[PDB]
Structures are given as structure tokens and as C-alpha cells.
Amino acid sequence: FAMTAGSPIIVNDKLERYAEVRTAFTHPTSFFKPNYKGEVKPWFLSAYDEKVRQIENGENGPKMKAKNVGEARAGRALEAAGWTLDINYGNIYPNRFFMLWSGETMTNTQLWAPVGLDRRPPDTTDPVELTNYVKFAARMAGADLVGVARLNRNWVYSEAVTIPADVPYEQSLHKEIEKPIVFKDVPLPIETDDELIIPNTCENVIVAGIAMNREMMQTAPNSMACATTAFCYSRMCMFDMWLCQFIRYMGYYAIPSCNGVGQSVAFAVEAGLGQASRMGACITPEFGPNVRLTKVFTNMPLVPDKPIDFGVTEFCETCKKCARECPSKAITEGPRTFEGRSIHNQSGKLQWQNDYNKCLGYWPESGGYCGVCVAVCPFTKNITEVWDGKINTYGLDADHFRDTVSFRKDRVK
Amino acid sequence: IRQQFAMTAGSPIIVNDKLERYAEVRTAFTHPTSFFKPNYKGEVKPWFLSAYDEKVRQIENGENGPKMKAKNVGEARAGRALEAAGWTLDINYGNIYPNRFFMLWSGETMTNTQLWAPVGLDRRPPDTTDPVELTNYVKFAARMAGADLVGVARLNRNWVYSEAVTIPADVPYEQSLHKEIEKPIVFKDVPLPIETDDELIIPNTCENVIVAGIAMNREMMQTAPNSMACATTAFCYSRMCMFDMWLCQFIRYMGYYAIPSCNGVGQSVAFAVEAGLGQASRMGACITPEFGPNVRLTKVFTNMPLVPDKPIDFGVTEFCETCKKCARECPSKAITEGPRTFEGRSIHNQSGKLQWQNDYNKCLGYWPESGGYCGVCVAVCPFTKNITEVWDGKINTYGLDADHFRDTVSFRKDRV
Ligand SMILES: Oc1c(Cl)cc(Cl)cc1Cl
Ligand SMILES: Oc1c(Cl)cc(Cl)cc1Cl
Numbered sequence A: 001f002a003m004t005a006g007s008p009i010i011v012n013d014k015l016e017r018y019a020e021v022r023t024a025f026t027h028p029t030s031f032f033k034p035n036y037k038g039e040v041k042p043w044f045l046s047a048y049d050e051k052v053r054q055i056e057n058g059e060n061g062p063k064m065k066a067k068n069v070g071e072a073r074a075g076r077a078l079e080a081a082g083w084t085l086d087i088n089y090g091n092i093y094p095n096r097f098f099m100l101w102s103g104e105t106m107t108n109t110q111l112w113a114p115v116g117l118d119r120r121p122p123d124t125t126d127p128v129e130l131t132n133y134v135k136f137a138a139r140m141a142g143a144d145l146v147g148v149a150r151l152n153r154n155w156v157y158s159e160a161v162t163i164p165a166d167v168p169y170e171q172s173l174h175k176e177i178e179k180p181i182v183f184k185d186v187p188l189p190i191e192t193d194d195e196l197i198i199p200n201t202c203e204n205v206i207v208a209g210i211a212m213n214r215e216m217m218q219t220a221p222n223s224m225a226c227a228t229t230a231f232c233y234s235r236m237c238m239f240d241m242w243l244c245q246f247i248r249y250m251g252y253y254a255i256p257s258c259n260g261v262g263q264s265v266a267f268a269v270e271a272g273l274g275q276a277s278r279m280g281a282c283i284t285p286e287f288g289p290n291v292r293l294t295k296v297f298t299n300m301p302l303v304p305d306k307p308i309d310f311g312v313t314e315f316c317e318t319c320k321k322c323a324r325e326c327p328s329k330a331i332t333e334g335p336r337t338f339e340g341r342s343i344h345n346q347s348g349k350l351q352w353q354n355d356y357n358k359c360l361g362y363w364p365e366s367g368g369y370c371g372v373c374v375a376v377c378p379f380t381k382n383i384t385e386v387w388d389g390k391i392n393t394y395g396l397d398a399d400h401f402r403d404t405v406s407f408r409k410d411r412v413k
Numbered sequence B: 001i002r003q004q005f006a007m008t009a010g011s012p013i014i015v016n017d018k019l020e021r022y023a024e025v026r027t028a029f030t031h032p033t034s035f036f037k038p039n040y041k042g043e044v045k046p047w048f049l050s051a052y053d054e055k056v057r058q059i060e061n062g063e064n065g066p067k068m069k070a071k072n073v074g075e076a077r078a079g080r081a082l083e084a085a086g087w088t089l090d091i092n093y094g095n096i097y098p099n100r101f102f103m104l105w106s107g108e109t110m111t112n113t114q115l116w117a118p119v120g121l122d123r124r125p126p127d128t129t130d131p132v133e134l135t136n137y138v139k140f141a142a143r144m145a146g147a148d149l150v151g152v153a154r155l156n157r158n159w160v161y162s163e164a165v166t167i168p169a170d171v172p173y174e175q176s177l178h179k180e181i182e183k184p185i186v187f188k189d190v191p192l193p194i195e196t197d198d199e200l201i202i203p204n205t206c207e208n209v210i211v212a213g214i215a216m217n218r219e220m221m222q223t224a225p226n227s228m229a230c231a232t233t234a235f236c237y238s239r240m241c242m243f244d245m246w247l248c249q250f251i252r253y254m255g256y257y258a259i260p261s262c263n264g265v266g267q268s269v270a271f272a273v274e275a276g277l278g279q280a281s282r283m284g285a286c287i288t289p290e291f292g293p294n295v296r297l298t299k300v301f302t303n304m305p306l307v308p309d310k311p312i313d314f315g316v317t318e319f320c321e322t323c324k325k326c327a328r329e330c331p332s333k334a335i336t337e338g339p340r341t342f343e344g345r346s347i348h349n350q351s352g353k354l355q356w357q358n359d360y361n362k363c364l365g366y367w368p369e370s371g372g373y374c375g376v377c378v379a380v381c382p383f384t385k386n387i388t389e390v391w392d393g394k395i396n397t398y399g400l401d402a403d404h405f406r407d408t409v410s411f412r413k414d415r416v
């Protein structure tokens, strides 16, 4: 489908769109992991067993002794709660639950129907004004970072993981299917029984960074690192809906995504949020790798942001600290290559190729989402002290929040 | 500052033997005698549909508020698009129906609770019962959940509506605004919060209310009664919803029960004054030291053992006594200039507590006229301190301000 003009990502002729089912989370060869008694479950139920084992043993992480059982119970209570606004870890099913590709059935849209903002032709078509408007709205909607790229279809999954439109939530995990994402000359995003169809007019992607909390993430791989993670996933989801509603009420269409539809790191790099790293995350100037990503696709005319260079590639060439502290040795200590390390990597793009089945393998063992690489990364800079220590709204840091102040001069040039 | 002005314990709200609990249906939004308002053409409609007509006409005429011209139709349109989108996570302006949609009184049905079922966090009895430790856990959770301010108070049932506006549980959303009913809120010796066909039953073990302040954006609010004050208001209603759900789940995963409310179930201002977030003012809001009245409230009710905070006293009553600025700026002359009394001006007030008594039907009346939620009182109040410049000016995450965001940093010392 061809690269966007000016993409920083180096690719070759082997590049092919990547089927979502191949992530270590969903793929048949990775999805099953031993629990701490040797039974092979879905990886996240094995992880559930370790989470309960730790609570019964007064631990906050793998052999990390908590103050008492009550503190161990509290960290997992806070992490479970964090996921409140997220379906089945990642909101990946397109046009289901919170990820509707059309706003028409939404309660919010129905309440506002007499105004008809979603039916009224745009009053603004100038991309400069629109970029400013949508970025203001993106920050209201909880983004700490927001960039705009031209949509590069190489990062959009060839097929999505989803459930059929008639499967209730309580059977969803047992009925996940694959479904192609195709681009057609259609007026609006539409889903048929056969296809998820993105219009050919869907020209831009808006990428949002959702800042995690450094104190909690520095506890990786233990429970409070899980908590700052889970809370950001619900913020991503609020963001996607807020922003998608705004764009529709401006007279355009918007596709939400969270962890679905496409690969966030590639979009974020192309939208100027940061650079790809050895660990594989987007490293951002404001938060390093310790930030979540979500994205919204739209036909709204916009000004694309310039990709940014602050030396991450060269730094990662000489650093290797995530690789050394990775508990599963998933992160390569070697050069970037074009050839994926296993099924889980998309071949054809120059990157540090890491073994993500080894990464996922450490989650049931540790009972968490690890994140040790993010915590030890130099761009990112006990559990009782966290609970008793500094906190602020949404886990944002006052001592840092000045850096994400935005004036129109920072939103559009 | 907050410690310098701590009162001794006991509700700061002065009452007399007349005070009775208040039926929610009496608010100016819901009561049959105030619900209808004329649109600019003179047609009588539900207040929000007349206000809708004003919104459409202002866009069409390139305005951001009542005969306030916008830079162009496009800017007028953008402001209303931002307003409408802010409300995404809110049902019918306030989430008032208890145990419906986002305000579920139990967590068992929620998708998050189902996903986490195998760990069983909400079946496991509490591993912590010490109220000091729990106050610190739930406050830290509350800040993670989007509260800028969080307080704890013993639940005062005077401020709990005697009957709630709600909808039958099997009514689809499209029909909800035509099928609102009343339903009593009663306290009984039951283990869990429970809804029957006839009652909303809060257990007698529901000892406490956790009150959350959710800060609005000062630049946008200072554009009141125009569209951008409506947008910071709308976005904070969705934050209040997410707060309620986040915190309720945390409390349940800690092994207690939790009731969310947003604008339903009871009177947020009274709870906030008793929880120590601020004091009542002439306009009738809770004025906080960090934000003035420019903050929204929501609350969660729980049997979780907690340490009540102290009510606050930083001179607001004395100041409002001689200020009268909101009363003079109020476009509908809704705010009284006189002394506080125990008798409300109309059905919309709850008599029996000493307060400034305002005409809230005059207030609602100005919302269809101006096409917004006004807020001139909040914006002009000294404790709080064009739209093209706002759109091009300072913004940060969630509309919060870096220059003041240090004021809400919290450590254990501050929480319990
Ligand atoms: O991205 C995540 C997903 Cl999809 C699932 C889990 Cl359990 C954790 C994380 Cl950090
Ligand atoms: O508090 C509000 C309610 Cl209940 C309804 C609307 Cl439409 C606006 C506001 Cl600011």
C-alpha cells in the first residue's frame, strides 16, 4: 500500500501488512503459558493464579514481600480497577463496545440529535484551523501529547482480531475471529459481515500519548507498575471516544482504535511524538518510553507534524540497558535488522528485532505486565513508599507538567 | 493553608427542626412547573430543547453566546462541537438515575468485573480494616481516578434525596427521557446496596461518603455564558463519571461495597462542605481554596472504614456577607443579595438549613435564552482567580493548569 511521504521508518520490498492475530497476546504459539503449578492456561489466567498466590503470601511481585497482605491486596485492587473502561485488555475489537466506527448509536449522539452537529456539513475545511481545533480538543480529552500524520497503511493490520456483532460480552473471549481491514471508495467507515472497510478518503491519523506515572512504573515488574498501566488504558479509551465525537460534530468521520486497527509505535513515530527504541517502544522527549499510545483515524483535513530526531537511535546503539535487565532476555543486544525474529515481528522494516514470546512468557511468572525496560530506560527519568508518597491528579507530575503546556504555536505552524 | 483553617469536628451546616429530606424531582431541571421554557421564537419546550434551538441559531449566525459574535461560523461551530463531545461519558446531563448505565450500585455486571472474576477481588473479604490505612489507599486511588481534591465525611442522610428521579430498569436509552419516574431512597439493615421494584435501598452500614472535586478550566469558564464555559463543564461531567466508576471498583476490589452518584442520590455541595473541600457561598456552590467555586463535585458512598476529614473555615461566609459580586453579575437576578435564612424561596430549595436562598428557576430560565449553562457567577467570583484567544491560548492535559497544579500534590501527611 506504499509508504507515506517522509516517513522516518526504513523499509524494504519484503514489507507486508501484519495480521493482528500474530501478536504474542493472541497467537496460538504464544497464547498458552505454564502457571506456577505447571498447568497450561491462557497466559492471563496463569498470570491471574500468580496474582492470587502473591496476595495470599503478602507479596507485591514475584518474591517481593509486601508490608502485609493488606498492602498486597491493595495493589491488585488498584490495578483491576484501572481497567474499568477497557474491554478484554486493549479494546482491540474494532467497531465493538467502546470502539464504534460510527457515533450514531451512542447515547451522547442521541441526546444531542436535535442540534444535528453530526449531520451538518463542516464549517471549517482549512487544515491549519482544524489542526489547532483538534489538538486543543485532544488535550481536553486527556492526551499529554498529540501529533498528526498522514495515514500509512503499512501499519494498519491486514486483518483484525474481533468478535461477531451478535456475540454477547460474556462469550467474547471464546468467540474471537479474524476479519480483514480493507480500504474502499466508500463515503463512511462501514463494517459488513465480511470486511471492516476504511474509506480511501481516510487520510490522517491522530496519535495521542497518555503519560504514565514514573513512581509506580519504577516498581516494575510489581503490582503498582500494573496499576499505572491499567489506569492509562481507560484514559486511552476516554480519549478515543471524546476525540471521535468532537471530529464527528465538526462534520467529519473518525475511527477509534486504542490497541487495535494498527501498530501504535509506527504511527507515533510518523506523527512526531518520538523515536523507535531498542526495547521497541516510542521514546518521547517528555516521558521517554513511559507513556501509552492511542490513535484516531479521520478524513478531517489536517497539517501533518514533522518527525523528530533527538538522538534516540544513536543512544540505543550504545546503551543496551533494557536488554541487560530484561528478566526474559527478550530484547536484542545486537544491530537493527530487516528480518523479523519470529512470527510476532513484522518483517521488512529496519528495527531492533526482539523475541516477544519470551517477553509474554515472563508475565504469568511475575503476575504482572513487567515493564522493567521502561523503568530502567534512561529516557524515563519500595511499594509502601509509593502508597505513602507523592501523587497528583491522574498520576501526572506537577514538577513536569509545565512541559506539556500548549499554545497555538505548538499545535500548528 | 488547609491545616491552618481546619475546624473542629461536627457538620458546619446549621439546621432547624423543620429540615426534611428533599425529593430530587423538585430541582428546577425536573419539576413540572420549571421544566418547560420558551425558545427564542416563543415556543414552549423542555428547557434543554429550547436551549438546543438557541445553539443552532447561534451557530447559523456565527455566534459563541447570546449576541456574542464569533470569529466566523466555523469558530461558533467548533465551540458547540467541543461542548457536545465533552458529554460523551454522561447520561442525560448528570447521570442522575441511580443504578442505571454508568451508575450501577453493584459491580457484578460490569465487563471489567467479569474479566477479573477469576482473581475474585470483590468476593474476598477485606484484608484491611484499619480506617487510617484505608483512607490513605482510597485517597491515592481517588487522585489516580481524576480527582483534584478528595475528602471524606460521615454520610449525613439529610442531604440524601428522599426520592430519586430514575427510569425503569428495562427501558431502552432512546425512551429514557420520556419514562422518568420517582423512586424512594431508603436505609435498611441489608448487607449490600439493593434495588427492588419499589425501593432504592442503601444499607445502614453505609457509613461514609468520599467527595471528589474535579477542577474546570479557568480560561474557558471565564468565557461564561458563552460556549467554551459549556465545554469545560461538559468535559468535567465525563471525568466525574469515570472517577465514580474507577473508585467504586477499587473499593469493591478492596472487599467493601460502593455506590456512585455523580449528580444523583444527594446534594453534592452539602457533602463537600462536610467533607472539608470548601465552604458554601452566596451563589450556593462549595468554594474551595484551590479553585474557588470553579470545580465540579461527585461522590461515592461506602461502608469502607474511613477517617472523616475536618470541615474547613477560611472566611468565605464573612466574605460573601459583604461581597455580592455574583448576585450583581447574574444575568437572571437569581442570586439573593440578602442575609441567610432557614426558609427557601421556592419548591426548588430545601428549607431547614441556614443558607443563602436563591431562585433557581430564574437561573434555569436563563439557560435556554443564552444557549448554555451560564456560569457567570462562578467566573466572576474572586475565589476563582475572547474565545478566539482561548482557542489559540494556553491549554494542558484535561484542561488543568501547570501554574497551579503543584497545589494539589499529595503525600500521606495530606491524606490521613
Ligand atoms: O498492553 C497490555 C495488554 Cl493488551 C494486556 C495486559 Cl494484561 C497488559 C498490557 Cl500492558
Ligand atoms: O450541571 C449541569 C446540568 Cl445538571 C445539566 C446541564 Cl445541560 C448543564 C450543567 Cl452545567
Ligand code: SF4
Pocket: A279, A325, A326, A327, A328, A329, A330, A331, A358, A359, A360, A362, A369, A370, A371, A372, A373, A374
Ligand atoms: S516488559 Fe519485561 S520482559 Fe518484556 S521486554 Fe520489557 S523488560 Fe523484558
Ligand code: SF4
Pocket: A277, A278, A279, A280, A315, A316, A317, A319, A320, A321, A322, A323, A373, A376, A377, A378, A379
Ligand atoms: S534502555 Fe537504553 S537501549 Fe533500551 S530503549 Fe532505553 S535508551 Fe534505548
Ligand code: SF4
Pocket: B283, B326, B329, B330, B331, B332, B333, B334, B335, B362, B363, B364, B366, B373, B374, B375, B376, B377, B378
Ligand atoms: S449560572 Fe448564571 S443565571 Fe444561574 S445563578 Fe449563576 S450567574 Fe445567575
Ligand code: SF4
Pocket: B281, B282, B283, B284, B319, B320, B321, B323, B324, B325, B326, B327, B380, B381, B382, B383
Ligand atoms: S462572588 Fe462574592 S458573594 Fe458571590 S460567591 Fe463569590 S465571594 Fe461569595
